[PDB]
Design a protein around this motif. Structure first.
Motif, PDB file in Angstrom:
ATOM      1  N   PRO A  88       0.814  -1.219   0.000  1.00 56.54           N
ATOM      2  CA  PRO A  88       0.000   0.000   0.000  1.00 56.54           C
ATOM      3  C   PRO A  88       0.849   1.270   0.000  1.00 56.54           C
ATOM      4  O   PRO A  88       0.794   2.041  -0.958  1.00 56.54           O
ATOM      5  N   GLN A  89       1.621   1.479   1.062  1.00 50.48           N
ATOM      6  CA  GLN A  89       2.532   2.609   1.137  1.00 50.48           C
ATOM      7  C   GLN A  89       3.919   2.197   0.647  1.00 50.48           C
ATOM      8  O   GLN A  89       4.191   1.027   0.372  1.00 50.48           O
ATOM      9  N   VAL A  90       4.809   3.186   0.552  1.00 58.34           N
ATOM     10  CA  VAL A  90       6.108   2.969  -0.081  1.00 58.34           C
ATOM     11  C   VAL A  90       6.857   1.830   0.603  1.00 58.34           C
ATOM     12  O   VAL A  90       7.418   0.946  -0.059  1.00 58.34           O
ATOM     13  N   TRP A  91       6.887   1.838   1.938  1.00 58.92           N
ATOM     14  CA  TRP A  91       7.745   0.895   2.648  1.00 58.92           C
ATOM     15  C   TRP A  91       7.299  -0.545   2.426  1.00 58.92           C
ATOM     16  O   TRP A  91       8.139  -1.428   2.227  1.00 58.92           O
ATOM     17  N   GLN A  92       5.989  -0.808   2.446  1.00 57.76           N
ATOM     18  CA  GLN A  92       5.518  -2.162   2.171  1.00 57.76           C
ATOM     19  C   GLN A  92       5.965  -2.617   0.789  1.00 57.76           C
ATOM     20  O   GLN A  92       6.503  -3.719   0.622  1.00 57.76           O
ATOM     21  N   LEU A  93       5.743  -1.770  -0.220  1.00 61.27           N
ATOM     22  CA  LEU A  93       6.113  -2.118  -1.587  1.00 61.27           C
ATOM     23  C   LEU A  93       7.590  -2.467  -1.676  1.00 61.27           C
ATOM     24  O   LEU A  93       7.963  -3.533  -2.182  1.00 61.27           O
ATOM     25  N   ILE A  94       8.448  -1.578  -1.175  1.00 59.70           N
ATOM     26  CA  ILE A  94       9.883  -1.771  -1.348  1.00 59.70           C
ATOM     27  C   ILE A  94      10.364  -2.970  -0.541  1.00 59.70           C
ATOM     28  O   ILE A  94      11.207  -3.744  -1.006  1.00 59.70           O
ATOM     29  N   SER A  95       9.839  -3.152   0.673  1.00 59.77           N
ATOM     30  CA  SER A  95      10.248  -4.291   1.487  1.00 59.77           C
ATOM     31  C   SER A  95       9.883  -5.603   0.808  1.00 59.77           C
ATOM     32  O   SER A  95      10.708  -6.522   0.719  1.00 59.77           O
ATOM     33  N   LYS A  96       8.647  -5.712   0.310  1.00 58.74           N
ATOM     34  CA  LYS A  96       8.236  -6.964  -0.316  1.00 58.74           C
ATOM     35  C   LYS A  96       8.981  -7.199  -1.624  1.00 58.74           C
ATOM     36  O   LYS A  96       9.257  -8.349  -1.982  1.00 58.74           O
ATOM     37  N   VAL A  97       9.316  -6.129  -2.351  1.00 59.61           N
ATOM     38  CA  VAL A  97      10.053  -6.298  -3.599  1.00 59.61           C
ATOM     39  C   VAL A  97      11.489  -6.728  -3.323  1.00 59.61           C
ATOM     40  O   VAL A  97      12.043  -7.576  -4.032  1.00 59.61           O
ATOM     41  N   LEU A  98      12.115  -6.158  -2.294  1.00 60.80           N
ATOM     42  CA  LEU A  98      13.513  -6.428  -1.987  1.00 60.80           C
ATOM     43  C   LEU A  98      13.709  -7.684  -1.148  1.00 60.80           C
ATOM     44  O   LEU A  98      14.850  -8.128  -0.986  1.00 60.80           O
ATOM     45  N   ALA A  99      12.636  -8.265  -0.615  1.00 60.91           N
ATOM     46  CA  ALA A  99      12.753  -9.516   0.122  1.00 60.91           C
ATOM     47  C   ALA A  99      13.135 -10.694  -0.766  1.00 60.91           C
ATOM     48  O   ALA A  99      13.458 -11.764  -0.238  1.00 60.91           O
ATOM     49  N   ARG A 100      13.108 -10.529  -2.089  1.00 59.40           N
ATOM     50  CA  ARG A 100      13.393 -11.612  -3.019  1.00 59.40           C
ATOM     51  C   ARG A 100      14.779 -11.535  -3.643  1.00 59.40           C
ATOM     52  O   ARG A 100      15.205 -12.507  -4.278  1.00 59.40           O
ATOM     53  N   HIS A 101      15.492 -10.419  -3.485  1.00 62.17           N
ATOM     54  CA  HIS A 101      16.730 -10.187  -4.218  1.00 62.17           C
ATOM     55  C   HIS A 101      17.900  -9.744  -3.353  1.00 62.17           C
ATOM     56  O   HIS A 101      19.043  -9.820  -3.820  1.00 62.17           O
ATOM     57  N   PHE A 102      17.666  -9.284  -2.129  1.00 62.56           N
ATOM     58  CA  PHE A 102      18.725  -8.922  -1.201  1.00 62.56           C
ATOM     59  C   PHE A 102      18.732  -9.884  -0.022  1.00 62.56           C
ATOM     60  O   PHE A 102      17.737 -10.555   0.269  1.00 62.56           O
ATOM     61  N   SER A 103      19.872  -9.945   0.659  1.00 59.96           N
ATOM     62  CA  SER A 103      19.929 -10.656   1.923  1.00 59.96           C
ATOM     63  C   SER A 103      19.175  -9.865   2.988  1.00 59.96           C
ATOM     64  O   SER A 103      18.891  -8.674   2.829  1.00 59.96           O
ATOM     65  N   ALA A 104      18.839 -10.546   4.085  1.00 61.07           N
ATOM     66  CA  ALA A 104      18.070  -9.896   5.141  1.00 61.07           C
ATOM     67  C   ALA A 104      18.758  -8.620   5.610  1.00 61.07           C
ATOM     68  O   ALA A 104      18.149  -7.543   5.637  1.00 61.07           O
ATOM     69  N   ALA A 105      20.040  -8.719   5.965  1.00 61.75           N
ATOM     70  CA  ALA A 105      20.778  -7.538   6.398  1.00 61.75           C
ATOM     71  C   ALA A 105      20.882  -6.518   5.272  1.00 61.75           C
ATOM     72  O   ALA A 105      20.671  -5.318   5.484  1.00 61.75           O
ATOM     73  N   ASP A 106      21.207  -6.978   4.062  1.00 62.47           N
ATOM     74  CA  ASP A 106      21.334  -6.060   2.934  1.00 62.47           C
ATOM     75  C   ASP A 106      20.005  -5.386   2.621  1.00 62.47           C
ATOM     76  O   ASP A 106      19.955  -4.174   2.387  1.00 62.47           O
ATOM     77  N   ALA A 107      18.915  -6.158   2.607  1.00 62.10           N
ATOM     78  CA  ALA A 107      17.607  -5.579   2.324  1.00 62.10           C
ATOM     79  C   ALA A 107      17.217  -4.558   3.384  1.00 62.10           C
ATOM     80  O   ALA A 107      16.725  -3.471   3.059  1.00 62.10           O
ATOM     81  N   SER A 108      17.431  -4.889   4.661  1.00 66.21           N
ATOM     82  CA  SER A 108      17.088  -3.956   5.728  1.00 66.21           C
ATOM     83  C   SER A 108      17.917  -2.683   5.632  1.00 66.21           C
ATOM     84  O   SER A 108      17.392  -1.576   5.808  1.00 66.21           O
ATOM     85  N   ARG A 109      19.217  -2.818   5.362  1.00 64.56           N
ATOM     86  CA  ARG A 109      20.072  -1.643   5.239  1.00 64.56           C
ATOM     87  C   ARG A 109      19.647  -0.777   4.062  1.00 64.56           C
ATOM     88  O   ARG A 109      19.599   0.453   4.172  1.00 64.56           O
ATOM     89  N   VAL A 110      19.323  -1.400   2.926  1.00 59.25           N
ATOM     90  CA  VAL A 110      18.865  -0.634   1.772  1.00 59.25           C
ATOM     91  C   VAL A 110      17.576   0.104   2.104  1.00 59.25           C
ATOM     92  O   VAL A 110      17.419   1.287   1.779  1.00 59.25           O
TER      93      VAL A 110
END
Ligand code: ATP
Ligand code: ATP
Ligand code: MG
Ligand code: MG
Ligand code: ZN
Lengths: 305, 271, 100, 48, 305, 271, 100, 48
Positions: free
Chosen positions: H1-23
């Motif tokens: 819905p909002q920006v953070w949900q979109l980006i988190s769900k998109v990046l959960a498939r291509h970055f590592s947990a630490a890398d995704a969270s840092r990004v």
């Protein structure tokens, strides 16, 4: 059989961006270039004309003074004109809040003073404006009223030598913040060079008169352009004389004989070139109306009544 | 039709040549050359340019003939034509026909030499160097003739030219030194056989030099022993010869550095 | 001699002669410009007295008591100095005689 | 009569004894060097 | 009352050494300069003509090719012609006896390659030839067939800026053997500058046609020369048309009207200038004979029969 | 007779202007200017050029009018005419008549300012700076108007322009900071009286600023105390004021270096 | 206080107030470009997500496991990302509201 | 819905947990900085 003696191909070649008009002095580079720009303005969305020749005449040709920045030509909505400025960028008014850095002050002073009068400054400034245009793309096409064959060839060669020099430098880059600026310039430099070397992007219009000196100066110019690999596939024969058989005079008859000899020589020599023939007119070709009328025959193959 | 222009241009050129309008003929020669090159007719363009240059030379049109000769060189360069003896003779004839003092010759030869095997040593065929040297010698341009001979591969004519140059210009005491200089320079050029033949011929034919390998002049004996050592390739012999003959080698100081090359070249002396 | 060992024996005799001759030959005279044309060196092989005397003073660093301008004025090239000019001509003629 | 007499008598009025003698001997040395190293080109230059 | 409409003063001013012919392109700089040189050759001991314009035409004008070194003009005994060479001094054949110094080899290679094609090279080489002449004095007078107004003005300015730069350098000389070479050049540099700035030593002939563009280009050129303080006291009006009242034609009549208007403007504007009027001829002005005939009227005030 | 050409040229210029051939009239204006200057008629040339520039402006010939104005400036420079209020008003009118965005103005003003007392500080008469600033303010070119006001000597109109600029463009919280910046810059320009008058007028007239030297805004009180100290010239007072108000002075960091100049300028602080 | 000695006594009161006020005033908000135009500094005051995410990774030095090209492909700006673009529009509208 | 949900769900498939969270947190920091320092010019740039 022969190519149509008109600039119709220039108009129809819409991808064409950079158009160069050159030849021997006094043949009509200014007038023919203005005519071509006027014709283009009726097709392209917006066309510019640049008087790279230090002896700017576009102001005289259009009877309307033009600054060093593009200005709309009176009587037209999408046609612009400018004269290249040999002088470097003016000095901005110092704030004076703090004592000025003498090093930069004197550097800019020398930049604006010494090279402003250097013999090669004119062509270099024209090249700088070309770079500015390749950064802007504001105008659909641009027509250059170049200086005579020699300096025009120098200008056309300048991109090649400057690009080669920058390539050498980048090879020597490994062996102090100017590196980023060099890397910013180099793309623009290959862009200008590539566009100049691409027939689909540019073409050189050679304008000449039916005389020995003009004829062979044009031949040398064409060969030099071929050496530079700049496409050129049309000539503008200008100031031709067509005698009136009703009341002929010796002067016009002899001039017509000479021009016919040299024009037959041209046609034999310049197969595969659109040789468009422009008659000498009994009135000054100046002002928007006269220039437009002249251009009309520049596009429609002139034939004496 | 499209090609008809070229034939008409050629006919007009013939007519202008007949009329004596030599400069217009030169310009039309240039135009025809460029048209032919655009068609990749390199051989035809070169032949036409050569004929035009010869004709302009015959009529005294020096500058026009030089320009056409330079166009001939351009045709040779652009087409990457392999060097052949006939073309070298052609270029030599053109060079001979030029005005000796005109700068164009300098521009021509430098280009011509630069064309023939332009990748290494300005050599081409030393046949070209020999032809240029012979032409200069006939013109009595002894300096350039000697230079080309040194860069040439002909020693016999080189030796004869050296004899004539020494007799006409060389002093009484420089007779041996001239041939010594030439021989050492040949060795500096890595041409041992040329040095041998030139020294032999110069010694045999020079009027002021007594026949016999045991020459009275110490310098001639030194040169003979140096040639024999170079044939042997023994560094110790070269050093001995250089040391024992030092008074003679000091006659012209530069000899020394020549020897420095010779030892490096024929005796493995490190630089 | 030691060096004789390296060279072939038949080279040995002549060299001694060349050595002996070499010790008596008068040094090389100045070379002909024709010969020097074959070498890249810029070596080569003061008719008027004012400049000759100026050069002599410069090489000696002599201070003219009165003036050098007076020295130049003292002659102005009169007949008694034309004596010296044709003396020069004769001297170079004798030079040419020794080098015919 | 000859060069040395002329130059000596001319320089006896304007140089000191040591200075005049040094100038004269330096001139003689330069003249000897010029004569020694004289070549044809010098002969043409003089003729002009 | 008005100054005689002939170049008679140029011939009579024997001290004159450097003569510059310039103006708008195609007006006849080459032909008029050749004519003036021919006229001078009948008075001075020996006269040279130099085609500083990169688009050299003196070869075409005299129908006899000329090298980059002075050559006697066919049909004359004391008249010489040359075309300036943009390329730097050719490379002498290496001896090869010793391994060449790569530093000097590449320095000379860049010298002969990069600046050979630089836009300002032409004027600089012309200036170098001027320096050579000021070192030689072989010819009594020299006539320069200059490029159009702009580049000719650049060339005429070059001595001033170069002399100023060398003066600055000598001020900075105190703060590696080139010093002697600079001190050798500087005399020649002030010599050329002084000669150019001396009316008694040099003069600029402005050649123009009776038209708006040519007229006002000539006006700008004259003003720029005045800024450079180069003496210029005569104009050559060229390619004029004189109608024949017996059998007039519309073209010649209209051209004569235009040229008369602009020539009256010239005469009003250019008081204190010898305005010599050269008619358009019905035959090509090429070759020694035709050029001499044209020069004859260049000196004798032309008047239609 | 010799002079007759000039009168005929002037008559032809009048006729061309009547006919509307404006560009030809511009060219003949240039020619007449050069002819007059050659005669040293500097005043007549300048007046003619000014009249021509005004006429070309009236008819919309912007580029021609700008060129003639530059010729007017050239006439002023070459003749070394002493600066007078009338000439400054003339130049200001010409500058106003120009196209605001055209580069010529930049070239004109820089030259004009460089002309008026060109030996020191680009000052001329601050009357010229005031006129340019007023013209720009009428054009609503607030940036350049403020710059010139700062280089000018008029503070009242400067303060009014600052008030208008802040109200139209300045944020809610920048009201005091604008005047503080202007005042500090005035002090950097060594014009204390201008700073005093501008601060007084800005405080008095600005709608959002409450009348009274005891201003609520700490920055305004700091500026008032700084002006009083500069009047006194006591370095210790300046240092105390700078230190105690540091939180306010940090609102825009550059203030600090301004103070560094002020202390150097009005309190003898070494650089 | 010490500094009060230097300044005139009547300046003393107000300054304290200015000091006290100064300790509570919230720092300067970002300035208006209009104001900044009066200063020579080049300070000033990522709509598309591909480049914003690339910048975030660069500032964090994060290594994409699969690929950054895949990250760019994963969206290609569809309607569900147009959601984010008008979210941006609304956020800057709210910014403007706070700065009217 | 909002920006953070979109980006988190998109990046959960291509970055590592630490890398995704840092990004994600770096993007949020950059967005906050951009919002803070937003000015009118930013508004026109966005409108274009
Ligand atoms: N077809 C024509 N009929 C009549 N007059 C012409 C014609 N073409 C050109 N002219 C005039 O001839 C003169 C020379 O032409 P123009 O100035 O356009 O030449 P140019 O090639 O631009 O010259 P330059 O190289 O000096 O810039 C001008 O007066 C021009 O008006
Ligand atoms: N008076 C004349 N009568 C007839 N033809 C002329 C006359 N003057 C010049 N011409 C011819 O007009 C053409 C232009 O003249 P010319 O080439 O001499 O001009 P230019 O000023 O030297 O030109 P450029 O600036 O291109 O070097 C040439 O064909 C020349 O022969
Ligand atoms: Mg033109
Ligand atoms: Mg010419
Ligand atoms: Zn007619």
């Amino acid at each position: 059989e022969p190519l149509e003696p008109t600039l119709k191909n220039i108009i129809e070649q819409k991808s064409l961006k950079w158009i160069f008009v050159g030849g021997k002095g006094g043949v009509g580079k200014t007038t023919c270039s203005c005519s071509l720009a006027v014709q283009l303005a009726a097709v392209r969305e917006s066309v510019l004309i640049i008087s790279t020749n230090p002896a700017h005449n576009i102001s005289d040709a259009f009877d309307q003074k033009f600054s060093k920045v593009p200005t709309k030509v009176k009587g037209y909505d999408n046609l612009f004109a400018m004269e290249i400025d040999p002088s470097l960028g003016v000095a901005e008014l110092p704030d004076e809040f703090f004592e000025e850095d003498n090093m930069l002050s004197m550097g800019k002073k020398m930049m604006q003073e010494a090279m402003s009068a250097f013999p090669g400054i004119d062509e270099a400034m024209s090249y700088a404006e070309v770079m500015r245009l390749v950064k802007g793309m504001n105008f659909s096409v641009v027509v250059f009223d170049t200086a005579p064959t020699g300096h025009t060839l120098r200008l056309l060669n300048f991109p090649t030598i400057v690009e080669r020099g920058l390539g050498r430098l980048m090879q020597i880059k490994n062996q102090d913040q100017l590196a980023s600026k060099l890397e910013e310039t180099l793309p623009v430099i290959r862009s200008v060079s590539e566009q100049f070397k691409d027939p689909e992007q540019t073409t050189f219009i050679c304008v000449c008169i039916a005389e020995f000196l003009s004829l062979y100066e044009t031949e040398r110019l064409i060969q030099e352009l071929a050496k530079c690999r700049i496409d050129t596939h049309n000539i503008i024969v200008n100031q031709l004389v067509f005698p009136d058989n009703e009341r002929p005079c010796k002067m016009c008859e002899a001039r017509h004989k000479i021009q016919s000899k040299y024009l037959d020589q041209m046609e034999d020599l310049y197969e595969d070139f659109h040789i468009v023939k422009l008659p000498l007119l009994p009135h000054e070709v100046r002002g928007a109306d006269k220039v437009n009328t002249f251009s009309k025959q520049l596009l429609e193959p002139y034939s004496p009544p | 039709r499209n090609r008809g222009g070229v034939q008409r241009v050629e006919g007009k050129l013939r007519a202008s040549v007949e009329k004596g309008d030599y400069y217009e003929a030169h310009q039309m020669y240039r135009t025809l050359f460029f048209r032919y090159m655009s068609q990749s007719k390199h051989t035809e363009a070169r032949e036409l340019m050569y004929s035009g240059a010869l004709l302009f030379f015959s009529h005294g049109q020096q500058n026009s003939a030089a320009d056409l000769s330079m166009l001939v060189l351009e045709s040779l360069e652009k087409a990457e034509v392999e060097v052949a003896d006939e073309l070298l003779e052609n270029l030599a004839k053109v060079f001979s026909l030029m005005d000796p003092n005109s700068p164009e010759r300098v521009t021509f030869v430098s280009r011509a030499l630069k064309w023939s095997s332009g990748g290494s040593g300005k050599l081409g065929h030393p046949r070209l160097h020999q032809l240029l040297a012979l032409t200069l010698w006939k013109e009595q341009n002894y300096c350039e003739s000697r230079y080309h001979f040194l860069h040439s591969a002909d020693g016999e004519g080189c030796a004869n030219m050296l004899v004539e140059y020494s007799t006409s210009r060389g002093f009484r005491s420089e007779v041996d030194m001239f041939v010594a200089q030439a021989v050492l320079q040949f060795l500096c050029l890595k041409n041992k056989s040329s040095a041998s033949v030139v020294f032999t011929t110069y010694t045999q034919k020079h009027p002021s030099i007594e026949d016999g390998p045991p020459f009275v002049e110490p310098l001639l004996n030194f040169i003979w022993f140096l040639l024999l050592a170079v044939d042997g390739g023994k560094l110790t012999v070269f050093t001995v010869l250089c040391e024992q003959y030092q008074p003679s080698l000091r006659r012209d100081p530069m000899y020394n550095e020549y020897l420095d090359r010779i030892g490096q070249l024929f005796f493995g002396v490190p630089p | 001699e030691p060096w004789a060992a390296a060279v072939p024996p038949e080279w040995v005799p002549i060299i001694q002669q060349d050595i002996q001759s070499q010790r008596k030959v008068k040094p090389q005279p100045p070379l002909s410009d024709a010969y020097l044309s074959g070498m890249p060196a810029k070596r080569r092989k003061q008719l008027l007295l004012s400049e000759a005397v100026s050069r002599a003073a410069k090489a000696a660093g002599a201070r003219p008591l009165t003036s050098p301008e007076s020295l130049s004025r003292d002659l102005e090239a009169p007949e008694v100095q034309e004596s010296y000019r044709q003396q020069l001509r004769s001297d170079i003629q004798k030079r040419l005689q020794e080098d015919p | 009569p000859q060069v040395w007499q002329l130059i000596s008598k001319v320089l006896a009025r304007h140089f000191s004894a040591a200075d005049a003698s040094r100038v004269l001997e330096q001139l003689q040395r330069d003249y000897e060097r010029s004569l020694s190293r004289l070549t044809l080109d010098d002969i043409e230059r003089l003729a002009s």
